[PDB]
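assembly run, all chains below
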Amino acid sequence: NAMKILFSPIGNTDPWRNDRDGAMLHIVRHYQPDRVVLFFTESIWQGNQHFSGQQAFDWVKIIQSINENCQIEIKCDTIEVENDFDAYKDLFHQYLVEEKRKYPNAEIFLNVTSGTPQMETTLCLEYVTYPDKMRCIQVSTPLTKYAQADCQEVDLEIVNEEESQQPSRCHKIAILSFREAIVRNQIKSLLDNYDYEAALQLVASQKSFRNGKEIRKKLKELIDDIKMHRVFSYLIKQYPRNEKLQKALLHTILLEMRHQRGDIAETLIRVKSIAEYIVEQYIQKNYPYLIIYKEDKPYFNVSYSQELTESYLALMDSGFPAYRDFLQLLEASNEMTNEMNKVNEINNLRNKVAHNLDSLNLDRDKNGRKITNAVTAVRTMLLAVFPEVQENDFHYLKQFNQSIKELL
Amino acid sequence: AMKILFSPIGNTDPWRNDRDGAMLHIVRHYQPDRVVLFFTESIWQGNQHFSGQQAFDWVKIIQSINENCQIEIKCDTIEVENDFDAYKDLFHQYLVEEKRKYPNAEIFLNVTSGTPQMETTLCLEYVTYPDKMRCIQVSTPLKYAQADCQEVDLEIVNEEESQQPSRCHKIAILSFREAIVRNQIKSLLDNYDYEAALQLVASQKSFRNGKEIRKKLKELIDDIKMHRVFSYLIKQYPRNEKLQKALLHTILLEMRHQRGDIAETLIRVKSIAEYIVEQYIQKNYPYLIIYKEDKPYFNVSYSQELTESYLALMDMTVDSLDRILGFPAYRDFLQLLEASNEMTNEMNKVNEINNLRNKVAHNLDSLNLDRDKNGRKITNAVTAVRTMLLAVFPEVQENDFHYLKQFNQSIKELL
Ligand SMILES: Nc1ncnc2c1ncn2[C@@H]1O[C@@H]2COP(=O)(O)O[C@H]3[C@@H](F)[C@H](n4cnc5c(N)ncnc54)O[C@@H]3COP(=O)(O)O[C@H]3[C@@H](F)[C@H](n4cnc5c(N)ncnc54)O[C@@H]3COP(=O)(O)O[C@H]3[C@@H](F)[C@H](n4cnc5c(N)ncnc54)O[C@@H]3COP(=O)(O)O[C@H]3[C@@H](F)[C@H](n4cnc5c(N)ncnc54)O[C@@H]3COP(=O)(O)O[C@H]3[C@@H](F)[C@H](n4cnc5c(N)ncnc54)O[C@@H]3COP(=O)(O)O[C@H]2[C@H]1F
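ok done. output:
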C-alpha cells in the first residue's frame, strides 16, 4: 500500500538473454512497480557494430505487458566515457532527487545489475548516502540467444513461459553495514566528549543498529538525567538509604564532566554550591545542632556552644565563607580545612564570572590551575563526608560510554 | 611512502588482446612495494573455457616490471561470486590487516578486476575508511590470454604498452561520504552541538571550506566555554562593555533554554537579571548604589525621603543594613521609586522562580517540568530577561537575538 518506483539502468543483457529475463525486466516482473524510470546511455540506444541499438525495442509495450497500469519514463543521455564515475555521480543523483521530490512516500527500487559496473557502484553509493525509502535489487545470471528487435513479441512470450517455472533471481543486497560503520566510528568519539545528544542523534538516524532500542533508551535517560539534574538510577540502587549522598555524588560527577570537557567557566560557577552542600552535611554529621533552619536556609545558632560564638566575633572584628570560618576555629590545618581553602581561592574569581558576567582567562595569574584544585577538593571532601562512596563510581560516565560502544 | 596494492583478479587478467589487464596495468604505472592478489577459488581452478588462473606465474609476471615487489596471493572459496556478503567482510579483513602491519602505507585498490560486486565492495570500503586509501580504475583500451605462451605474451604486452598513455584513473567518489557528513552536521548545528559539529567537520578532510568552518567553529566553542563576548558584538556595540556582556549572556541563556538544559537555565536567569537591573539602577538613580568594596552596597544618603521607606519596609535602623545588594534589594528599591511600571512586572516573573532556584541550585534537587507547571514559570523568567535587557539597553537591535541561528546558516552555506 505505497507507490513503488523503479530506477533501472539498461545494458546489453536487457531486455532478455538466453530466453531468460534481463535484470530490468526481472525486477519489474517480481516487484511489480507502479512507475519505472529507465536510463539508457546514448551509445547503447543508438548502437555499435556488435549491438543493434536499444531504440529498436518497444520499452513501454514490453513493461506494461507483464505489469498492468505501469507508468514508464525513458531517460537518454550522451556519455562520452561510459565507465566514468563522474558521468553518473550527479546525473543519477539528480534523477533520484526528482523522484523523491515528486513522490515523498514512495519506495524506490534501484537496479544495480544493468548497465556498466560503475552504474551499479554509483547507485549503491547513492543508496548508502541516502537510504531512506530506498533499496537496491540485484539480479543474478542463470546458472547463446540474443535479444532480437525483429522477433520481439515472440521472444517476450517465450521468456515468459520459461520464467513461469523458474525461481526469482532478484536479491535485495545488504550493504548498509558500511554506513553503519561510518556512524559507529563517529559515535565513539562523541561519547568520549559527553556529547550524548549528538550520540543519540547519530544513533536515531541509523535504523540499521541491531541494539538501537537499547542504545536510544540508555542515552535518553542519561540526557534527561543531565538536563534536570536527576540522580542516575544506578546511583539510586548503589546508595538507596542516603539521598544526600546521591545528590552530592551526581553533582560531583557532572562537575568533573564539565571540567574535563572544557566547560571551564561553567565549572567554576558551580564548584562552590557543591562545596557548600558537602560542607553543610559535614557540619550536621559531626556538630549536629549547630545549624538551625526556620525557612530551610542555614542560620548559625549560639546555644550549641556559646563560648565558640564569641570566638567568631573576635575573628570578625579583626554560606561557604561562614562554614570555612566556623570549621577552622573548631579544627585548624586538618584534612577538611586545606580543601576548603582551595575552594576559597576561586571565591573572588567566581564572583567575577558569575555576577559581573566577565570572560574566563586561564592564562592570567595561573587561573585554570586554581580551578582544578577546587574541583579536586570537592571530590576529596565528598569522600570525607560520606565514607561509603566507592571511588569506582566516579567513572560512571566513562563506564557508561564503554557499555554503549559494545552495544554499537 | 610505502605503497601497497590490493588487487582482485579477473578473466581479463593478466592481459587481454596484447594490452595489460587491470592488475598488471596498475602495477606498471604505480610500482607498488607490496601486491596482494585476491582470487576466487573458481577463477583459480577454472576448467570451464580455460585451465584456470593457477597456470600463470603471478609472482614472476608481476616482478618482471617491478624490480622490488613482495607479492601475497590470497585464495578463497566463494559459493556465490555475485554476493556482496562474501566480499564486504572478507575484503574488510584483508585491508584491515594490511593497514595494521603497515600503518603509514598508501593503499591502492584495483576497482576494475573481478565481478562488479568486487568493484562495488572495494569502493564501499574506501568511502568508509578513506584514510591512506584510494581507488584506481583501468579503462578498456578503446584473443584471450593462455598460459602456455606466457613469456612471449608478456613481452608482446610490454612492447605494445611502451607507446600507450597511462589508461589508469583515480576515481573521485568521496563526494558521497562528504554528503553523509554534511547532513550529519546540519542537524548538529540545529541543536547547538558545536563541539560535535567541529569533530565531524575535522574528520572530513575533503571539505572545501573546512579550514574556514573550523576556525569559526573553534571561536564560538571557546566563546561559549569561556564566556568570551562574540567579536561581532564587540564591533556592533563598542563603548558599552556592560551591554556586550549582558547581551552575550541573554543569548547563551536562551540557547540553553531552547535545547533543554532547563536546570542550567534556571540557575543562570537570576544572575543575568540581577545584572540587568543593577545597570538599570545605576543609569536611572546614580549613586543610589555605592561600590564600597567591589560589590554593590546601599547608599544610605542617596535620598533620605525613601531611605526611611526602605527602613520602613524592613518590618530596625540603618546601622545594620550594610549587606551587599542582591536581587531582592533591587526589587525593593524599585517598588518604592516607581509604582508597578513595565519593569517591576518583569522582575516579578524572575521572582516567581526564586524558591525553585534555591531548591535546585543549592539543595541540588532534581527538576520537573511537568510538576507544578515549573517549566512554564521558567520560560516566563527567560522572556523577562530579554524584555528587561531591551528596556535597560534600547540601543540593542532585536535581530541580534538570532545570532546563533545566523551562525548556523553561515556554517551550513559553507558546507
Ligand atoms: N539472463 C541473464 N543473462 C546474462 N546475464 C544476466 C542475466 N540476467 C541478469 N544478468 C546479469 O546482468 C549483467 C550483465 O551485464 P550487462 O547488462 O551485459 O552489462 C555489460 C554491458 F552491457 C555494459 N556496457 C558496456 N557498454 C555499455 C554502454 N555504452 N551502455 C550501457 N552499458 C554498457 O557494461 C557491462 C559490461 O560490459 P563490458 O564489455 O565489460 O564493458 C566495459 C567497457 F567495455 C565499458 N565501456 C563502454 N564505453 C567505454 C568507454 N568509452 N571507455 C571505457 N569503457 C567503456 O565499460 C565497461 C567497464 O566495465 P569494467 O568491469 O569496469 O571493466 C572491464 C573491462 F573494461 C576492463 N579492462 C581493463 N583492461 C582491459 C583490457 N586490456 N581488455 C579488456 N578489458 C579491460 O576490465 C574489466 C573486465 O572485467 P573482468 O576482469 O573480465 O571481469 C568479468 C569477469 F571476468 C568477472 N568474473 C566472473 N566470474 C568471476 C569469478 N569467479 N571470479 C572473479 N571474476 C569473475 O566478472 C566480470 C563480469 O563478467 P560476467 O560474465 O558478466 O560475470 C557475471 C556473472 F557471470 C558472475 N558470476 C560468477 N559466478 C557467479 C555466480 N555463482 N552467480 C552469479 N554470478 C556469477 O558474476 C558477474 C555478475 O556481473 P553483473 O554485471 O552484476 O551481472 C551480469 C549478468 F550476470
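Chain A touches chain B through 72 residues (CB under 8 Å).

The two ends of chain A are 33 Å apart (CA to CA).

not gonna interpret more than that til we talk
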